Amino acid sequence: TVVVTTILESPYVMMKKNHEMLEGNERYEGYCVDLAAEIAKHCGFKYKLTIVGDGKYGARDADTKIWNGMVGELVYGKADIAIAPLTITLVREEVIDFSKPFMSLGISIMIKKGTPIESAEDLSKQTEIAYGTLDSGSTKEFFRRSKIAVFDKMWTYMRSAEPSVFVRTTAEGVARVRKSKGKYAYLLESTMNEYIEQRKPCDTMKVGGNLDSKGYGIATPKGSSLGNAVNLAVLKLNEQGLLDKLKNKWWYDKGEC
Amino acid sequence: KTVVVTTILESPYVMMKKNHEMLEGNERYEGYCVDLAAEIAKHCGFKYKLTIVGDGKYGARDADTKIWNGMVGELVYGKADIAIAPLTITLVREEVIDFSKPFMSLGISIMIKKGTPIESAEDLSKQTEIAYGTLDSGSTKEFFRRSKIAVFDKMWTYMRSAEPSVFVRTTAEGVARVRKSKGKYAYLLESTMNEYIEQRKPCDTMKVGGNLDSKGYGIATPKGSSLGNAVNLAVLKLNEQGLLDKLKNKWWYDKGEC
Ligand SMILES: CC(C)S(=O)(=O)NC[C@H](C)c1ccc(-c2ccc(C#N)cc2)cc1
Ligand SMILES: N[C@@H](CCC(=O)O)C(=O)O
Ligand SMILES: N[C@@H](CCC(=O)O)C(=O)O
Ligand SMILES: [Zn+2]
Ligand SMILES: [Zn+2]
């Protein structure tokens, strides 16, 4: 039985309304739940969905060099595969393997409706509206590493701002937008932003273009014998239009705005 | 040793320089893929030679003969070391060659002559006055050939039987066909090529509708090659540093003529 690490992050993996009367894999639903079932069916394996213990995507401690999150679960042998909205990144591909991407995304801006911001450049030129990102993920690293002037400027602000502009979970960022009266903007992946914009209470918006262009991949420990098959499965699912079918199902068929 | 790169004359990816006959070797060519090859070779630490695929094709396996043609075949049969081109990542190809993570996103799209009364694939499928087709030997043809989606299956049943042939040998031929056909030919081609031509004179075509699928171009190497790991890491670094976005803008939008 293959141990799958994943993360609670809507609409990728959510607890079912009736989860308390369900067991095992049946507790959960979402895009990644459906994708896991399809990958396991094409690859011929049984599997156990497990939520990452620390609730993180994965970053490396600069001092100890120890990885956390789903990345660490793979690196240290705690899970066999990560099926999640896990961004393919150079630093991570150095320590784990990724399938070809199953979904495209870019960094984007979430505002409370009516907030006078149209772009990253607008954020970087003003100070009334605070802005930040998730911890231990690929968007914080994007700002930490960018040499593009606007983005460097934003990072200098964010890394020193008080109180802290960073959040532990996507849900914490979204809530901070919603409650901040237009004075907090949240930087997060377009996929999450576009799902949130179609949910009640319908008070947030994506603005501006995306800041980058990248993909999520299925991750395995380096050199795993599962990596080949998983990759071919992703290519097959994409070619059959199954990935587009799931995207519709969990985004746009699930729209309430 | 010097790495032999296979590529294809396809604008704006690889083009002959106006003055190519006065230049030699790699200097004869320009375009997005030319720029990208230089950067992959620098980051991976190799010398290279650009060569244009002899048959002018992307790559497909003959159904009876089982021989791969195009760039894919040059890799499969040992004629080239790497392909740096707008080569779509597909399952059938991944079974015989290796691909990096994609360097560019694309989907199949519709090119019309401006004013043509079509907005969508469904529109094309429900009418007969306007013919439509694809490049005769690439991933777009295969997408229709294999599709189980009703609109697309309907389109393939039309295309495969239409006379005269709605298929073309090169992108350029399809684009010329749209331009000459007074709105009676639509061309099914990748969004990247469509969006490039939309910004070129005579400014008489446009992309219409959403894309039909969502995929990527990858750098390809023969299966199990030693260069594959390094090339993938290069692609990742270049995407993270914004080089690939810069190149896109350089060859599509910075010198757009429309
Ligand atoms: C054949 C498909 C399985 S795929 O490899 O093209 N992936 C599909 C998916 C929708 C996707 C995600 C991400 C990107 C993408 C990533 C990075 C870059 C760059 N540079 C360009 C495109 C392209 C496609
Ligand atoms: N997808 C991201 C997490 C979300 C983000 O950083 O915005 C990762 O894999 O780190
Ligand atoms: N990029 C395609 C060729 C163009 C097309 O089929 O539209 C391939 O790799 O086959
Ligand atoms: Zn399936
Ligand atoms: Zn520490």
Question: Would you summarize the structure shown here?
Answer:
The structure is a homodimer. Chain A is of the alpha/beta class and 257 residues long.
**Strand line-up in the sheet with most strands of chain A:** 9-10-8-11
The CATH architecture of the largest domain in chain A is 3-Layer(aba) Sandwich
Q: Could you tell me how far the N terminus lies from the C terminus of chain A, measured between alpha carbons in angstroms?
A: 40 Å
Biggest sheet overview of chain A: 4 strands, mixed
* Integer tally of domains of chain A: 2
- Count the beta strands of chain A: 13
PDB class: transport protein
Keywords: AMPA receptor, allosteric modulator, transport protein
Assembly: dimeric
Entry title: Crystal structures of GLuR2 ligand-binding-domain in complex with glutamate and positive allosteric modulators
Describe this structure in words.
Chain A: The record marks 117 as: Crucial to convey clamshell closure to channel opening. 2 copies of one chain form a homodimer. Chain A is α/β, with parallel strands linked by helices and 257 residues long. The first copy, chain A, has helices at residues 31-43, 69-75, 90-93, 120-124, 138-145, 149-160, 170-179, 190-197, 227-239, 242-252, and strands at residues 2-6, 14-15, 28-29, 47-51, 81-82, 96-98, 103-105, 107-112, 130-132, 184-189, 204-207, 214-216, 219-221. Chain A folds into 2 domains: 1-105 and 215-254, 3-Layer(aba) Sandwich (D-Maltodextrin-Binding Protein, domain 2); 106-214, Periplasmic binding protein-like II (D-Maltodextrin-Binding Protein, domain 2, 3-Layer(aba) Sandwich), CATH 3.40.190.10. Chain A has 10 helices and 13 strands. In chain A, α1 (31-43) crosses α9. The interface between A and B is medium-sized, with 28 and 27 residues. The complex binds ligand 1YV, glutamic acid (2 copies) and zinc ion (2 copies). The ligand CC(C)S(=O)(=O)NC[C@H](C)c1ccc(-c2ccc(C#N)cc2)cc1 sits between chains A (100-101, 103-104, 213-215, 234-235, 238) and B (89, 102-105, 214-216, 239, 244). Residues 61, 63-64 of chain A line the site of one zinc ion.
